[PDB]
Design a protein around this ligand. Structure first.
Ligand code: SF4
Lengths: 289, 244, 289, 234
């Protein structure tokens, strides 16, 4: 079966672990407390699974979680959130992650929502990377209504460390999206990439804030952003770069508005019209066919 | 009735005149190749026939299948049997190779999924790619310049038009001899297409049925592949001015 | 001679005009007042000249200026500032500019400074553009010390309008640079380009803030930024893009830090050393040689 | 004395080798071509001899003009009379074509303005570019790929090195025929230069004085082009 966590209607239902991996989960002051540890030298073949579900109305979830990676270790985990019929929902989670020497971690989260529109989603995450450590993360929200979304991330990294961050969303009706994330490169030869992708429709509005600080010799960083606008939706983006060292280098690029003209003309020359071609490009951007 | 005719055509790019009254014709089931110095008219002629935005004539006519096409848009030109391949093709976020080759497919293959499935594997083997490692990859920035160009040639075979226009068909591919490309030209002609080919190489021009030389926006020579090829070697290969 | 305004020792020394253009100036309330009016349908073979010069201690000067450019008319404006002794001096100017239907305007400003760093320069401008009008602007500060520099621009544009803006700087010792610029594309078919280039060394500090708002059909914008860092210098940049129409598109590109490695190795493979190779790349980017 | 000896050379990039136990040499006034399949280490040799960053001998030795060069950087190797032309050159913002061709110009021509300005006109006509169209243009992203690669070969003619390394000199040029390229190789050999050419063309390999075949990071066979190309073909 394998190592896992299960929560339903804001109650814990299951938690279990293999050898070399320790998992903990209990309820306290109406919140959920959870912990994960992997010991020195263990590398795991398969992800941990954590699952959340809400079929009811006026439910609230608050989770605090601590994750520890010891020397030479490797792990990954999946988050699944299903909110069918969801109305008056609040989902909030607070993460602390520590990555040891030469260790590797990856994180994925995927959301399924209905059409009833009364939802708040609010993850907050703080991460520390030691010598030679690897960090990867991905958030996807592209099925159903979003409602309201808030993302906060803070990353601090030492020498030879590597970071890779992705977010992908699709917004409709009166949905609201807020993204805020910061990376500090505080050791030699450290590097990062930050990516965002998506589309907006109807009356929806979106704001993106992305920051990299280059504080140490031989640091490297890249940011890239793309967003497609339809109807009477509104978009704002604010990427920030700071450099404090003679041997660092940082770069960024973005494009916001209607679809690219050379991609559109290329599909017209194969026998499609503008409404057929524009929808093929949007389905690519949001991760469909 | 001729497949394509071009009559006294002039074209401008802002305040600069580029094409200065070219005349051309293409017959059914023919390969016709155009050669000459780069930038002197070669690519702007190919964009002007396909109707690509910002390439519009100030005088002259273009007639396809006996209809004058100056009012028709790119979708209307593509509906009646004309298609283009770019020198450097576009890159797509999130579109997979097996979705891309299906999109323009000829109406005789689209009617049965097994005929459509076999045509795509046949078309990938013809361009010396290995099907089962490429079908699930994205048509994005990860591919090299030679991989992206072999995938665009597999699309023309699958789409099977009445007229295909190719701009610099080997550009971006690292290849030791042109016999991979000549095999694809022979296959399209056996199915009954006509090809209009824009090149700088003589090795591809000597495989065509007719050759024409464009310099400084005008036709200088036209006729037999071998008589024009010897002039191209002897005179153009030591000329630095590139204007008569 | 030609249409001009000249100031030294905080006092107007000459103002002169020509047929089809009116120029005026006077001193009031501790400030210089000046006027430029261009008559309907006129176009000129030349630029108009502004001149400022200071050669003595503790000077402060304030200028308020208004420029009117009527239907189907054109001008170009040249301004030179020379400040060879830097002992505690203030230069402040406020501009109002109006351009009418089908009119053309261009502005150039040049600064020459000495070796002493106790200087403050504070230009502020608001611009109005009516249908089919053109605006060009250039600021250059690359010789001597800067001291403290602080620039503000606001621009509003109607249908068929064209805008482009350039700034270039080179900062040394304890120099301070700030720039703040915003463009609102409110008419149909309006276009703009914003560009910045510079280098920073020693103990210098740079902050850059650039904004485009795309509010109307078929409007287009681009922001392009590059900065070179040496020694103990610090750099911050914040580009902003906002779009509110189905048919608009805006793009941004930036690079901050050291010179590119392949450019540097290409110049050393021709027999230069790394300090000869770095200074050739910088003088191309800031347009010095 | 020989120009170059490469002796017992081993190189790895990341986890594993790209060159292993390579042995090679070059004579004065010689054209020598290297041939072989893609990924056999051909460009990794060219970067390793010139000393580009991220390539270093893990074992073995390199000798140029009877002197060891593993202690020397790119500037010190270039001062001895060696140089490289990249397969896809770099672009420079705000530098003119006529200013770019004055960098590294040979100590014979560089001394006087007339002798240098005519050397630049001769070099541009020899690659089929009209000087009066190109001298006042910038070496930036507004040139096409074929124009930028012709300008880099006009730079090698102005430097006139003792040893030159060319990685695919025909790639990205809009050639009418290979007789455009062989005319440059004839001009350099007439002045006494030695050439190392890395190429995928049997048409240019036929023109070399000697040819060598490198496969999987080892030298297989070398000698007369008429033996080694026909041996390679099977
Ligand atoms: S020889 Fe004549 S046709 Fe050929 S490139 Fe020169 S000018 Fe053009």
């Amino acid at each position: 079966k394998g190592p896992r966590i299960i929560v339903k209607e804001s109650r814990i239902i299951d938690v279990q672990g293999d050898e070399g991996i320790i998992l903990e989960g209990k309820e306290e002051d109406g919140k959920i407390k959870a912990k994960i540890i992997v010991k020195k030298g263990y590398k795991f073949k398969y992800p941990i699974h954590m699952c959340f579900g809400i079929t009811e109305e006026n439910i609230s979830q608050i989770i605090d979680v601590e994750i520890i990676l010891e020397e030479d270790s490797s792990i990954s985990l999946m988050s699944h959130c299903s909110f069918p019929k969801g109305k008056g929902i609040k989902h909030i989670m607070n993460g602390i992650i520590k990555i040891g020497k030469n260790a590797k971690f990856s994180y994925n989260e995927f959301h399924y929502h209905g059409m009833d529109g009364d939802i708040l989603v609010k993850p907050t995450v703080k991460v520390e990377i030691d010598e030679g450590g690897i960090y990867i993360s991905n958030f996807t929200l592209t099925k159903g209504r979003i409602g309201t979304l808030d993302i906060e991330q803070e990353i601090i990294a030492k020498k030879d460390a590597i970071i890779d961050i992705t977010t992908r969303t699709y917004a409709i009706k009166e949905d609201v999206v807020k993204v805020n994330e910061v990376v500090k490169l505080n050791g030699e030869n450290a590097k990062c990439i930050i990516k965002s992708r998506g589309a907006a429709m109807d009356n929806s509005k979106i704001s993106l804030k992305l920051k990299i600080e280059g504080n140490a010799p031989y640091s490297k960083g890249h940011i890239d952003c793309a967003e497609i606008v339809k109807g009477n939706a509104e978009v704002e983006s604010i990427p920030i770069v700071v450099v404090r060292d003679d041997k660092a280098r940082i770069t960024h690029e973005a494009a916001i508005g209607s679809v690219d003209k050379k991609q559109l003309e290329t599909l017209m020359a194969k026998g499609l019209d503008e409404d057929e071609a524009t929808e093929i490009i949007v389905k690519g951007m949001i991760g469909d066919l | 009735i001729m497949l394509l005719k071009v009559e006294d055509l002039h074209v401008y790019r802002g305040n600069r005149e580029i094409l200065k009254g070219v005349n051309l014709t293409v017959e059914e089931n023919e390969i016709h190749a155009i050669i000459g110095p780069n930038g002197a008219g070669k690519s702007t002629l190919a964009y002007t026939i396909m109707g690509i935005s910002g390439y519009k004539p100030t005088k002259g006519r273009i007639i396809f299948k006996g209809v004058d096409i100056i009012d028709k848009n790119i979708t209307e030109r593509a509906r009646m049997g004309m298609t283009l391949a770019w020198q450097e093709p576009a890159r797509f976020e999130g579109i997979k190779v097996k979705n891309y080759l299906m999109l323009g497919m000829n109406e005789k293959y689209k009617k049965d999924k097994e005929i459509a499935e076999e045509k795509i594997r046949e078309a990938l083997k013809l361009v010396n790619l290995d099907p089962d490692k490429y079908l699930d990859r994205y048509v994005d920035e990860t591919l090299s310049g030679g991989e992206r160009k072999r995938i665009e040639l597999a699309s023309i075979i699958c789409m099977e038009p009445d007229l295909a226009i190719l701009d610099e068909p080997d550009s971006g591919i690292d290849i030791v001899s042109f016999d991979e490309i000549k095999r694809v030209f022979d296959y399209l002609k056996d199915k009954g297409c006509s090809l209009l080919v824009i090149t700088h190489r003589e090795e591809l021009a000597e495989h065509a049925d007719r050759v024409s030389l464009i310099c400084a926006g005008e036709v200088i020579k036209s006729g037999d592949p071998k008589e024009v090829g010897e002039f191209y070697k002897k005179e153009c290969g030591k000329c630095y001015k590139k204007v008569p």
